[PDB]
């Protein structure tokens, strides 16, 4: 469809700050608009609707509909980890809802004391299979994927030791080779200069 336009992002927003999601629509006869939240494994869930020009607050969400400029917006105050999701803009066209392609939102964790480090982990079963773990880096470290078909690298992923109130990022790399060492594993990426590489 060409009546709901939104940029795919991903948008990165610091934890606590306001996230701003925008969407434009091609037909000024449209009157009824929606924001749907879809977590990565899940179905779209409705979080806000707006049927007249103006503002609307519900908790941390603010939806805004501007008919003169033909845009609709969703503001998320006090961004949390749980807001990381895809946010779908949607307009009613007669009796059917039409969806935009969705904007992906990453709420970046506020890492108190970064301690970037690459560790190697070995299989619980055959202790010749191993894995490299890049962890404890700050939230604006970008992990670069492999352009080496024999090397697999996963993107950033934040975990919460909720009991100890400690968040931490990490990425994982492994290889069909096993002479492959973790020193040269993440080198296709820009990593902190003082990343700890133990021996």
């Amino acid at each position: 469809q060409k009546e709901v336009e939104q940029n795919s992002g991903p948008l990165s927003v610091p934890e606590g700050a306001i996230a701003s999601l925008n969407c434009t629509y091609s037909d000024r006869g449209s009157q009824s608009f929606f924001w749907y939240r879809q977590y990565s494994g899940k179905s779209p869930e409705l979080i806000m609707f707006i049927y007249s020009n103006g503002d609307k607050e519900d908790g941390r969400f603010t939806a805004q509909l501007n008919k003169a400029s033909q845009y609709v917006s969703l503001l998320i105050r006090d961004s949390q980890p749980s807001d990381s999701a895809t946010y779908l803009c949607a307009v009613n066209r007669d009796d059917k809802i039409i969806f935009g392609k969705g904007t992906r939102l990453h709420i970046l964790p506020n890492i108190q004391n970064p301690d970037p480090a690459v560790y190697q982990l070995r299989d619980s079963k055959s202790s010749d299979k191993s894995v490299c773990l890049f962890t404890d880096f700050d939230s604006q470290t970008n992990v670069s994927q492999s352009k080496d078909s024999d090397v697999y690298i996963t993107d950033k992923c934040v975990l919460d030791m909720r009991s100890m109130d400690f968040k931490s990022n990490s990425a994982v790399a492994w290889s069909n080779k096993s002479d492959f060492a973790c020193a040269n594993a993440f080198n296709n990426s820009i990593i902190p200069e003082d990343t700890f590489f133990p021996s």
Partner: protein, 240 residues
């Protein structure tokens, strides 16, 4: 309660038929079908009011067939499946214009049931260097070599499922990105304190639910039939 859909997953050889079912919320006069692929929105397929199918999109081609016989449940039939029919098929019902979605049916159309594989699973034990440096311990699970890409990974500590300290990759990545029916890989981390890991009575399982062939699927190989099944791997704690 809520909108229900079945099956949750379907693998089909290209050229075969397939039928999905939606059970909406009973009070809703309106029913919708949508198709959705990753990084894209739900694309409209058709719209029911009571039993009458009032609207079809060009995405609902001739091979596509949707009915809501009793103005209640709905079925969507794709005949002679193509690879480009692989998607999540969403159902939604409405009392007016707000739409309420079911959990979907994930369809994978493969050239040949023989390219379906269960994951292999391995658990990687916390590094001694991390333990000494941070007083914490990260376990890593790897699930590799599965096709199609519908798995559910979970961590189980002493027989109970844990969510705190867990990070799983949002998507499985392709093992052969230049192959149309590439097998996939998935990784997950679980971080516990060093002292919880050094306890030798603590048991750590990474479990991967894989959704594979059906009991009435034709299996013509000698390697085991990759049916729906759990694969898991385990590790016990160790006191330095």
């Amino acid at each position: 309660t809520g909108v229900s859909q079945n099956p949750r997953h379907k693998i089909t050889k290209r050229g075969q038929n397939v039928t999905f079912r939606c059970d909406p919320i009973s009070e809703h006069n309106r029913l919708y079908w949508y198709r959705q692929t990753l990084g894209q929105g739900p694309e409209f397929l058709t719209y029911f009011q009571n039993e009458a199918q009032l609207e079809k999109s060009r995405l609902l081609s001739d091979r596509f067939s949707a009915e809501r016989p009793k103005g209640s449940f709905s079925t969507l039939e794709i005949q002679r499946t193509e690879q480009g029919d692989s998607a999540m098929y969403l159902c939604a019902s409405s009392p007016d214009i707000e739409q309420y979605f079911g959990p979907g049916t994930r369809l994978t159309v493969t050239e040949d049931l023989k390219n379906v594989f269960p994951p292999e699973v391995a658990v990687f034990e916390p590094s001694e260097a991390e333990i000494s440096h941070t007083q914490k311990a990260t376990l890593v699970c790897l699930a590799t070599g599965f096709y199609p890409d519908h798995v559910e990974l979970s961590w189980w500590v002493n027989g109970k499922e844990v969510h705190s300290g867990v990070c799983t990759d949002p998507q499985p990545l392709k093992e052969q990105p230049a192959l149309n029916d590439s097998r996939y890989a998935l990784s997950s981390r679980l971080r516990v304190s060093a002292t919880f890991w050094q306890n030798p009575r603590n048991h750590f399982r990474c479990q991967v639910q894989f959704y594979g062939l059906s009991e009435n699927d034709e299996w013509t190989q000698d390697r085991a039939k990759p049916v729906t099944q759990i694969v898991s791997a385990e590790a016990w704690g160790r006191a330095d």
